[PDB]
C-alpha cells in the first residue's frame, strides 16, 4: 500500500508524458530543487508559471507542495470560518482531488481528457506493472480508474516524509537540539506576540505537534493585483480574483477576496510571494502588514516599486480586526521576523538561502 503507492506517485510526479506535448511534469512547476515551486522565468518573472503549450501563463503563483499534506480537508468549522483544502482559493478538498486538475488544465499540463491521460499511462510498461499491482489488472484501460489511481499515487507521494520532513532549524530548536540566535529568537517572540500568530499558527493556544505556521483559514489581507502577472495570465484587466468565493459551493459574499493562509515553511526560498507572486522579496511581504498599522508615509509604499501598494483587488472582507493591531513593526522586528522565517527552511534547502 503506502510504500509502493507513493513510489508510483514518485514516478508520475516527474513524468512529462502527462502533459499534452510531453514537455511538463508536476516537477517542472513544482521543482523539488526549489522547495516544489517554479524556478522558470516567464513573461511575469517568477510570479506565475507557463503551461505545457510554452505560452499559457497562470494567474497565481505556484505554491510549494512541502507540508501541504498537513492541511486538513476543506471544511466550515463551528465558528463559521472555512479551513483547509488545496489551492490558494481552497477549491480542491484535499491533495487527491487537487492532483488531477493540473493534468487537464489547458493553461498547465493540458491533457484533453482522462482518456488521453490513461493512454499515456499505457505506453509505459513500467506503469502497466506499477498500477496493476496496487489497483488491479486493467486499471489503465479504464480512464476513470486510471486518473483517480494516478491522483491517489500523487497524493500519497506528497504525504511522504520527504515533502514534510520537519527538519528545519526551527524544528531542531523545538526539539532542544539547537538554539535560536538572538535575532531568530527575537523574531520568534515577535512572531508569536504580534498579529502574525493570529493566522500563521495552527492553534489558538496549546502546543501544536506538527506546526506548519498556518491556521488553514481564509483571509483577505487586502493585496493589490500583480499587473504583469495579470497581464500574462490573459484573464483581462477587468478580471477580479475573488479567492475562496471562487470555490464552487461557496456563495457567501463575506468570502470574496479571501485566500488560504499559506504555510510559512520554506517561505524564505519560495519567492515571489502571495497568491499572485506580487512581492519578490520576503522582507516586502512582511512590510506589507505595516500598511495597516504604521502611520509613516513609507508604510503605504511598496519598497520594490517605489509606488503606492495599489488598492486591494478586493476592498471588502479585509481582516481588519487582525491586521489593525495598533502596532508597527520597526526595521528591527522586520529583520528579526526575516531571521525567524529563515529558520523554517527544510534542511535540504538550507543551501538555497541566498
Amino acid at each position: 500500500a503506502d510504500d509502493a503507492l507513493a513510489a508510483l506517485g514518485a514516478q508520475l510526479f516527474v513524468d512529462p508524458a502527462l502533459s499534452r506535448n510531453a514537455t511538463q511534469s508536476c516537477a517542472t512547476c513544482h521543482d523539488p530543487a526549489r522547495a516544489f515551486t517554479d524556478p522558470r522565468e516567464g513573461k511575469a518573472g517568477l510570479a506565475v508559471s507557463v503551461g505545457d503549450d510554452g505560452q499559457s501563463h497562470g494567474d497565481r503563483n505556484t505554491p510549494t507542495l512541502g507540508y501541504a499534506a498537513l492541511v486538513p480537508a476543506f471544511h466550515r468549522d463551528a465558528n463559521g470560518k472555512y479551513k483547509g483544502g488545496q489551492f490558494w482559493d481552497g477549491r480542491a478538498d484535499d491533495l487527491k482531488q487537487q492532483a488531477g486538475q493540473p493534468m487537464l488544465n489547458p493553461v498547465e499540463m493540458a491533457m484533453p481528457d482522462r482518456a488521453a491521460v490513461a493512454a499515456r499511462l499505457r505506453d509505459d510498461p513500467a506503469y502497466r506493472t506499477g498500477f496493476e499491482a496496487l489497483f488491479g489488472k486493467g486499471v489503465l484501460d479504464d480512464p476513470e480508474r486510471a486518473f483517480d489511481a494516478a491522483a491517489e499515487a500523487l497524493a500519497a507521494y506528497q504525504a511522504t516524509g520527504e515533502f514534510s520532513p520537519f527538519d528545519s532549524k526551527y524544528d531542531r530548536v523545538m526539539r532542544g537540539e539547537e538554539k535560536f540566535t538572538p535575532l531568530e529568537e527575537f523574531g520568534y517572540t515577535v512572531f508569536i506576540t504580534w498579529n502574525c500568530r493570529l493566522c500563521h499558527m495552527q492553534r489558538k493556544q496549546g502546543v501544536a505537534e506538527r506546526e506548519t505556521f498556518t491556521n488553514f483559514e481564509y483571509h483577505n489581507i487586502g493585496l493589490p493585483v500583480n499587473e504583469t502577472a495579470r497581464e500574462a495570465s490573459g484573464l483581462g484587466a477587468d478580471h477580479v480574483d475573488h479567492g475562496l468565493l471562487a470555490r464552487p459551493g461557496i456563495e457567501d459574499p463575506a468570502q470574496s477576496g479571501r485566500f488560504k493562509v499559506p504555510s510559512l515553511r520554506n517561505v524564505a526560498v519560495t519567492g515571489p510571494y502571495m497568491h499572485n507572486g506580487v512581492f519578490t522579496d520576503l522582507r516586502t511581504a512582511i512590510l506589507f502588514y505595516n500598511k495597516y498599522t504604521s502611520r509613516r508615509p513609507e508604510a503605504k509604499i511598496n519598497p520594490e516599486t517605489g509606488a503606492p501598494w495599489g488598492e486591494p483587488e478586493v476592498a471588502r472582507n479585509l481582516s481588519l480586526a487582525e491586521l489593525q493591531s495598533g502596532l508597527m513593526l520597526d526595521d528591527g522586528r522586520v529583520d528579526a521576523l526575516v531571521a525567524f522565517l529563515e529558520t523554517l527552511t527544510d534542511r535540504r534547502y538550507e543551501p538555497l538561502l541566498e
Binding site: 530548536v173 523545538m174 538554539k179 538572538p182 529568537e185 520568534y188 517572540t189 515577535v190 508569536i192 506576540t193 504580534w194 498579529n195 500568530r197 493570529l198 499558527m201 489558538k204 493556544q205 496549546g206 502546543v207 480586526a321 487582525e322 489593525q324 493591531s325 495598533g326 502596532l327
Partner: protein, 131 residues
Amino acid sequence: TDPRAKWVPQDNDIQACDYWRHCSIDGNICDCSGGSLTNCPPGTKLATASWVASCYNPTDGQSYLIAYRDCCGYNVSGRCPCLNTEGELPVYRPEFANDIIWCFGAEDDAMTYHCTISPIVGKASHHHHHH
C-alpha cells in the same frame, strides 16, 4: 507570603497568584471577574497584543510560552489581583514587559485594563529566562 522569595509555581488553583501560568501576569486574573483562565469576562474586549513569558509547569516540568492577553474596556476588576514578573524585562523589551497596558487590537479601541488571561502558545525557552 514571603513576597521576595523565589516564586513557587503550583498547578492546582488558577485564582491564586502562584498559579504556574501567572508567572508574568500583572493586574487581575480574569477568572475572578467572570472570565476564565483563557477567556475574557462579558462586556470586555479581548486585546490582540500580548506579552509573553516562558512559565515553568511543575506538573510535567515542561516550560511553556504564555502569551498574556488583556481584556479591556472595564475598570479594573479589583478581584484576585496578582503581580508576578518571571522573565519580565523592562519596557524597552516590551515583549517581555508587563506594566504596559497590552490593550492594543481590542475592539472599540478599548484601552482600559480589567483583567488578564494566561493562555499557552508554545513550548519554548528564552536566553534571558530558561529553565
